[PDB]
Design a protein around this ligand. Structure first.
Ligand SMILES: [O-][O-]
Ligand SMILES: [Cu+2]
Ligand SMILES: [Cu+2]
Ligand SMILES: [Cu+2]
Ligand SMILES: [Cu+2]
Length: 495
């Protein structure tokens, strides 16, 4: 179902059994995944979130992030708890009111309090482009062509320990999938196609942790969009998709009428496809209603390599073509030790007063801001470079920056930088030990912006820092509504 751009979104508790195992959940809009929030580029989004949660086992507070939306001028609407807001308390509501100038494509939204998105609060967010340059490439782009991949857990998030290796208990494709252990024959999702039609498939990782090797038996996939950024056409037969990443790909329904497995193998949890785990069904209209008996290719000959992607627009790369070729160049020390992650020696632990409120209250420098050692100020209209060398305990870590997308100057498993035409995106795998994944952006968005691993279990274990972009202009750029000012008094009184 699609709702928006002006809509109510109620947040409730509900037991669900997507793999046949009933457990509690935290739901946005009453379903899993949450309904698709949609609009056209330049639309004003007004999302009235009603917190109706009662089950403390998963926290009755909440806060929602519109993942990959820049929120320029509306840093208050961004959603990360204790960075840009206090959580909304149960029985209250809050209006996330923002615009999406300049942006189109495939996004999602999720709880950004603690590990609550794992417990169910996650759904797709699509901004349609009435003049999409990729339009002519396909016949069908709508709610039936969105594909969510989701890790599902039988253990309540709050009780995951932590960390501590944590693994999912099944993979759900469009909200349905089978358990990894003691697999019950529960309903699988179906994606239906018509012989000779081309589909814009919107592949969305709403994962709390694993990356997926995604493929469709018998079929190619032509990537045209990556994390919101239009890409040149790239035909692959497999897609490794890390947590929070998105791809639009054209699926040409050119095979014989029949049933074909859709495969999503996670990097941890259940391996393979026995009994229909890690699976959904591509069915052609006219096929018999039965399980596919198809097989994956023994070897995928054109799997996605990030370095093969290029923006469709002439994005280029800001700054100078050598490492450090930026106004403010950073090299982050990313560590793990004794169950906690650190960025430049500091494990992130959320401050009592949100970073944005701290600034609005009169803080001027990163030194003035809590948590200590967890904030790096950036000056305005400057080219930033962030090298993010891997090595820290598994891994591979998908790093995400709020309020920005970014040129991936260097990708995983490949030590050659690209300063000409690398893909831009918002979530990037930093690869493996010895890698040096490097990103670049410009500071054109004053506000405190979260940079963290999108493995949610890693975020709760402290793998995050805040880029306090243009602290001096933050208050002026982001006027807040009274309801926002009301949040922290409410939260703090209730707790
Ligand atoms: O973005 O989490
Ligand atoms: Cu996110
Ligand atoms: Cu985000
Ligand atoms: Cu991580
Ligand atoms: Cu985030």
């Amino acid at each position: 179902v699609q709702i928006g751009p002006v809509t109510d979104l109620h947040i409730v508790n509900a037991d669900i059994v997507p793999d046949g195992f009933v457990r509690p959940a935290v739901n946005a809009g009453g379903t899993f995944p949450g309904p698709v929030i949609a609009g056209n580029v330049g639309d004003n989004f007004q999302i009235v979130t009603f917190n109706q949660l009662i089950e403390c086992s998963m926290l009755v507070d909440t806060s929602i992030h519109w993942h990959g939306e820049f929120q320029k001028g509306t840093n208050w609407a961004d959603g990360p708890a204790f960075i840009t807001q206090c959580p909304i308390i149960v029985g209250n509501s809050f209006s996330y009111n923002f615009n999406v100038p300049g942006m189109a494509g495939t996004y999602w939204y999720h709880s950004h309090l603690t590990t609550q998105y794992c417990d169910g609060l996650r759904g797709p967010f699509v901004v349609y482009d009435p003049n999409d340059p990729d339009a002519n490439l396909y016949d069908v782009d709508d709610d039936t062509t969105i594909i969510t991949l989701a890790d599902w857990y039988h253990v309540l998030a709050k009780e995951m320990g932590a960390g501590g290796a944590i693994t999912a208990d099944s993979t759900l494709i469009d909200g349905l999938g089978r358990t990894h252990v003691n697999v019950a024959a529960v309903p699988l999702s179906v994606i239906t196609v018509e012989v000779g039609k081309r589909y814009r498939m919107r592949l969305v990782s709403i994962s709390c942790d694993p990356n997926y090797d995604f493929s469709i038996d018998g079929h190619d996939m032509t990537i045209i969009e990556t994390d919101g950024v239009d890409s040149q056409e790239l035909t692959v037969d497999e897609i490794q998709i890390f947590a929070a990443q998105r791809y639009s790909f054209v699926l040409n329904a050119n095979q014989p009428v029949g049933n074909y497995w859709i495969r999503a193998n996670p990097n941890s949890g259940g391996e393979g496809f026995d009994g229909g785990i890690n699976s959904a069904i591509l069915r052609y209209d006219g096929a018999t209603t039965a399980d596919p008996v198809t097989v994956a290719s023994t070897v995928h000959t054109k799997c996605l390599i990030e370095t093969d992607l290029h923006p469709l627009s002439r994005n280029g790369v800001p700054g100078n073509p050598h490492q450090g070729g930026a106004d403010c160049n950073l090299n982050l020390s990313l560590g793990f030790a004794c169950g906690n992650f650190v960025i430049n020696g500091v494990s992130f632990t959320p401050p009592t007063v949100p970073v944005l409120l701290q600034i609005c209250s009169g803080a001027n420098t990163a030194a003035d801001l809590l948590p200590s050692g967890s904030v790096i100020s950036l000056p305005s209209n400057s080219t930033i470079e962030i090298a993010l060398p891997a090595g820290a305990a598994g891994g591979p870590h998908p790093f995400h920056l709020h309020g920005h997308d970014f040129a991936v100057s260097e990708s995983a498993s490949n030590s050659t930088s690209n300063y000409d035409d690398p893909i831009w995106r918002d979530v990037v795998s930093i690869g493996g030990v010895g890698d040096n994944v490097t990103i670049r952006f410009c500071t054109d968005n004053p506000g405190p912006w979260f940079l963290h691993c999108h493995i949610d279990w890693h975020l709760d274990a402290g793998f995050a820092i805040v880029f306090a972009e243009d602290i001096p202009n933050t208050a002026s750029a982001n006027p807040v509504p009274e309801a926002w000012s009301n949040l922290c008094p409410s939260y703090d009184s209730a707790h």
